[PDB]
Amino acid sequence: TFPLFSDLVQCGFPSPAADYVEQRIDLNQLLI
């Protein structure tokens, strides 16, 4: 159970802002 922040980080250009509304999930439930 680790944070999955709602906002997506833009790898192309520096994003205008990064809010961090925090959603939490575990690896096993997220991928399996």
Binding site: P3, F5, D7, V9, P16, A17, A18, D19, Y20
Partner: protein, 333 residues
């Protein structure tokens, strides 16, 4: 048959609402002239371009924030001076208790006409702002450092006493009681905010602004002003390079940026902004470090170009009208 009955019912309901609450209680959005967005210049042409509508919106709420010595008070005093040059009445609610009247005069502010208040508590400041808005005779109101909007309970309290979100509740109630009054009276309320650090932020901006979250929602425009350099006359630091980001905009496209120089004792360098905008709009030619206008080499470098354009008011005015006509997305009537 059915449509006629629906129209009759709608007309009866509208008439009942108008009788109950007033003539302007409800009307079609297209024929509501009071809802039109009217703007005033911020003292920076590039910022007027970045705001889309040509300046800060009248009758709204605007938040300005940034780090220390980023130029919040100087930008606010330029806004106030620009408003006062048009005959508007402005008020400065300085909660920081750190206003210099001499410097305000040096920026072009008519200190003989600017209302200044040193409120003891945040509630007193917000009540003064509410009264000034309800009067309708004040066009611009500025609250300096809403971080200093201390509640009366905290003032009467001790250092270290915990007042959880009490300032936030006071600010929320102030926004609720102020939005309608400001819209009715066509008064622009500018809030100046400081930046606090956010602890335990794994990802995201670790900076908030004091006062809570209500100011984030109620602000029509939120500006993030930062100092990104210094202006040097060889050795002495005579000014600062400033970048202003419009992180929120309810009247135009947001996230546009503006760059301008704040000169100490003079304020925002308008003529340098004119130079930069003319260069960008293919009106002033830049050949390396050489600036030229219509073939005539006006100088070498931004400072020399600014001095030359200051020395020739006619061409400065010409380039100013050309830039205002071309760049402004929403030219004011």
């Amino acid at each position: 048959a059915i449509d006629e009955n629906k129209q009759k019912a709608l007309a009866a309901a509208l008439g009942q609402i108008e009788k109950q609450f007033g003539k302007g209680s409800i009307m079609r959005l297209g024929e509501d002239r009071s809802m039109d967005v009217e703007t005033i210049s911020t003292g920076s042409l590039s910022l007027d371009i970045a705001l889309g509508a040509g300046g800060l919106p009248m009758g709204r709420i605007v938040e300005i924030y940034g780090p220390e010595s980023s130029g919040k008070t100087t930008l606010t005093l330029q806004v106030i001076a620009a408003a006062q040059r048009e005959g508007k009445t402005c008020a400065f609610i300085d909660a920081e208790h750190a206003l210099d009247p001499i410097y305000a005069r040096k920026l072009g502010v008519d200190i003989d006409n600017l209302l200044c208040s040193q409120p003891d508590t945040g509630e007193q400041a917000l009540e003064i702002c509410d009264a000034l808005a309800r009067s309708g005779a004040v066009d611009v109101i500025v609250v300096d450092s809403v971080a200093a909007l201390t509640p009366k309970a905290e003032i009467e309290g001790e250092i270290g006493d915990s007042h959880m979100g009490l300032a936030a509740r006071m600010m929320s109630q102030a926004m609720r009681k102020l939005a309608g009054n400001l819209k009715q009276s066509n008064t622009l309320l500018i809030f100046i905010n400081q930046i606090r650090m956010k602890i335990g932020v794994m990802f995201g901006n670790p900076e908030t602004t004091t006062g809570g979250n209500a100011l984030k929602f109620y602000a029509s425009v939120r500006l993030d002003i930062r100092r990104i350099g210094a202006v040097k006359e060889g050795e002495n630091v005579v000014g600062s390079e400033t970048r202003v980001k419009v992180v929120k905009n309810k009247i135009a496209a947001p996230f546009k940026q503006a760059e301008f120089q704040i000169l100490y004792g003079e304020g925002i360098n308008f003529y340098g902004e004119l130079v930069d905008l003319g260069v960008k709009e293919k009106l002033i030619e830049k050949a390396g470090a050489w600036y030229s206008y219509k073939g005539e080499k006006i100088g070498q470098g931004k400072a020399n170009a600014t001095a030359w354009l200051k020395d020739n008011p006619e061409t400065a005015k010409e380039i100013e009208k050309k830039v205002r006509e071309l760049l402004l997305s929403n030219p004011n009537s």
